[PDB]
């Protein structure tokens, strides 16, 4: 999960990192405001959407840019009048933007250094690392390209905590001197720190910054929180929106569907992570646009299939739905019945190809074929998919 | 160290096995299951039901006492997720040869704990979390995947998902060939068991003559997994290995049910994964339908049929 910066920010802030004075506007007016009593040399405004890249981002208002910089409130209002309820989209959303509803309105530093820092749980190595390049505000991805030797990593042991070692060590990696090496180390540890507190999976800081006046100031945040924390990190995750989510995504999460949207018009759900992916793979391998994924989880009941349909046939562009069920736990049986019900009760208008296997399979076949309904039962993964993608050619 | 665990995970009839959290909703109904399937499944632990009995089965107070007075060599975990942490340490405390965390949501931070704790000991091999478990058809059964479409045979199964392995386990005897060992290893990204264990096992495993390696975006283990190929099946008794990488549409920063499944910061592309694989001689399925079809092609090609 992850929470807009103004959030991210104050986390921070709340766990002594240095970060920006700011405040938050839903308003053009209200960032006006906030920009006057910053009362600051030079305001940094930033749309808040979670997708990265808002710097060089378009918005639907026809503003380019989705962070400025000015010295006069009354173009922090101009500036937000073209943001708040506009789309804003990145090399990171897709085309048709994110619609902001909150900007920052922050004071701006003088950056005189700009580096890279990053707190990761390393899947690579099983611990958490420390990411750092003296080469920031940047892709961290170009850098490790074009520079490899630039990117620095200390492994921190889990048990033992990040040592001042391996903070001053980073610290001097940045190029922060010697004078500031010291803060720079001290924020890390805090970052660290926070990062664990917090369940993050990553906390990304670019630019971990040096302003003229010597601070060692976190100039823009990313933090990735585990989704698997929320039952320990309830406060964090209150403050998660889903105000972002494509609104079917919303739905079919109330009732644990893992539904991710895609771009097309076959639309699946499928039992089980892989499986799920692999039946949007096997309908793209064989021609069609898989119109998402949706995953039911380990207990499909009768309400799931139903809302996972009720869902799908909301969206106009699917043109047909296709359901690969392997039944093992819940067998087949009782699947097939929530299967027909839900045709029933919702009158589907798109061609259905369902593929059962696994569990009182047999029974299940007998379900759909004694429904009468016009429901297309594959003999396999592949039919499934070939079939599919036929009904909507 | 923690690699010399790695044998632990071919479980077989001679494994005895407990389930922790055994009274409860999840480790009763799996437990019920596994009873009938012919696991040897001997007891289970649960806080202050030691002397007691469940199921039939006599309940211990503490891992330590169960593995004591049964002799159980391998324990499973359905516990909730908030506390399957402190299941598995007390799994790993009291020493059981091998244990299997089905459980799904434990948090990373305590996975990567775990896992700090795990390599740092020879004892305990962990297989998952977020898991179906591992099962030898016929004879040993640890977890939830459904024991009926197994049938004993001579292919090596690892996967990161449930029921696609499924899909490939059905498959598989479909061509008629069966399974040797199958192993979930699990969709989390920090885990107790990687690709390359099973490989391991599955390449020095007389009875195991072709692999199937089931991968999806996010991470690097299908990478490291290509790697080991590479070196150590390479040869004139190479045994072949057939594989599907899930996630070939999945779409960039998204979580993709799995908590592991994610590709970010540009890493974790399910078509890098392919090409490291092929290079390493591993014949990838393109279609998740063909695992059982490009397998059987494969022993065929070699006169192994
Ligand atoms: N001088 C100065 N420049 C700033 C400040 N905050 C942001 N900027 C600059 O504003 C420009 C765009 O902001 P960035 O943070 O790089 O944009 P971005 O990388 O697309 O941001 P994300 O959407 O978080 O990925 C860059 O040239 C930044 O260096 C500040 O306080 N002072
Ligand atoms: N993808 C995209 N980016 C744009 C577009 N227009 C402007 N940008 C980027 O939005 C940011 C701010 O744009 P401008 O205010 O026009 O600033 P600029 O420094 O003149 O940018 P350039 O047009 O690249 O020279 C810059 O990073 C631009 O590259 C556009 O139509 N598409
Ligand atoms: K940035
Ligand atoms: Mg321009």
Do not use: W
Not at chain 1, 122 to 149: F, H, K, T, W, Y
Not at chain 2, 252 to 261: I, N, T
Not at chain 2, 284 to 305: C, D, H, N, W
């Amino acid at each position: 999960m992850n929470l807009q910066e103004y959030q991210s920010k104050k986390l921070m802030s709340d766990n002594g990192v240095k970060v920006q004075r700011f405040f938050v506007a839903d308003t053009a007016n209200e960032a006006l405001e906030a920009a006057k009593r910053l009362n600051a040399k030079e305001i940094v405004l930033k749309a808040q959407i979670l997708a990265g890249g808002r710097g060089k981002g378009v918005f639907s208002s026809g503003l380019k840019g989705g962070v400025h910089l000015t010295k006069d409130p009354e173009v922090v209002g101009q500036l937000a009048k073209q943001m708040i309820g506009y789309n804003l989209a990145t090399k990171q959303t897709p085309k048709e933007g994110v619609k902001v509803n909150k900007v920052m309105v922050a004071e701006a530093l003088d950056i005189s250094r700009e580096t890279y820092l990053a707190i990761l749980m390393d899947r690579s190595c099983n611990g958490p690392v420390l990411v750092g390049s003296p080469q920031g505000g940047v892709d961290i991805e170009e850098v490790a390209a074009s520079n490899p030797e630039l990117i620095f990593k200390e492994q921190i042991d889990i048990i033992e905590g990040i040592k001042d070692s391996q903070a001053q060590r980073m610290a001097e990696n940045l190029g922060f001197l010697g004078p500031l090496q010291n803060q720079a180390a001290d924020q890390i540890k805090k970052l660290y720190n926070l990062f664990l507190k917090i369940d993050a999976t990553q906390v990304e800081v670019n630019p971990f910054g040096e302003t003229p006046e010597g601070q060692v100031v976190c100039f823009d945040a990313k933090i990735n929180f585990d989704d698997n924390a929320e039952f320990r990190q309830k406060d964090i995750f209150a403050m998660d929106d889903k105000s972002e989510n494509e609104p079917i995504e919303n739905e079919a999460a109330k009732y644990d569907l893992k539904y991710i949207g895609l771009d097309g018009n076959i639309a699946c759900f499928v039992n089980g992570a892989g499986l799920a992916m692999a039946t949007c793979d096997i309908i793209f391998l064989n021609g069609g646009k898989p119109a998402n994924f949706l995953d039911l989880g380990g207990g499909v009941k009768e309400s799931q299939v139903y809302q996972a349909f009720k869902l799908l046939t909301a969206d106009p562009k699917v043109e047909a739905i296709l359901v690969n069920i392997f039944g093992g736990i819940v067998n087949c049986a009782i699947i097939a019945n929530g299967i027909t019900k839900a045709c029933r009760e919702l009158e589907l208008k798109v061609p259905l190809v369902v593929r059962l296997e696994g569990t009182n399979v047999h029974e299940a076949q007998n379900i759909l074929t004694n429904s009468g309904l016009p429901i297309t039962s594959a003999v396999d993964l592949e039919d499934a998919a070939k079939k599919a993608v036929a009904s909507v050619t | 160290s923690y690699t010399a665990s790695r044998k632990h995970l071919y479980v077989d009839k001679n494994t005895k096995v407990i389930c922790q959290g055994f009274t409860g909703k999840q480790g009763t109904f799996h437990s019920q299951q596994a009873l009938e399937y012919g696991t040897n499944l001997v007891g289970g632990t649960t806080p202050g039901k030691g002397g007691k009995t469940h199921l039939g089965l006599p309940v211990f107070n503490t891992v330590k006492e169960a593995k004591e007075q049964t002799g159980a060599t391998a324990s499973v975990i359905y516990v909730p997720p908030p506390f399957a942490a402190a299941a598995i340490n007390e799994a790993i405390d009291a020493e059981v040869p091998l244990v299997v965390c089905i459980t799904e949501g434990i948090p990373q931070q305590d996975m990567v704990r775990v896992k700090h704790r795990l390599l740092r000991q020879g004892k305990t091999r962990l297989i998952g979390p977020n898991c179906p478990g591992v099962i030898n058809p016929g004879e040993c059964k640890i977890g939830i995947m459904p024991g009926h479409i197994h049938k004993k045979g001579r292919i090596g199964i690892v996967s990161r998902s449930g029921t696609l392995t499924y899909e490939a386990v059905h498959q598989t005897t479909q061509v008629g060939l069966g399974q040797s060992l199958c192993v979930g290893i699990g969709g989390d990204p920090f885990n107790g068991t990687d690709f390359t264990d099973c490989l391991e096992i599955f390449l020095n495993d007389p009875a195991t003559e072709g692999i199937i390696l089931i991968g999806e975006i996010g991470g690097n283990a299908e990478e490291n997994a290509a790697e080991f190929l590479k070196q150590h099946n390479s040869g004139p008794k190479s045994k072949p290995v057939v594989s599907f990488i899930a996630g070939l549409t999945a779409p960039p920063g998204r979580r993709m049910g799995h908590a592991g499944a994610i590709i970010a910061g540009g890493k974790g592309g399910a078509k890098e994964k392919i090409t490291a694989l092929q290079s390493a001689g591993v014949v990838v399925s393109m279609s998740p339908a063909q695992l059982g079809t490009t397998i059987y092609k494969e022993f065929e090609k070699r006169k192994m049929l």
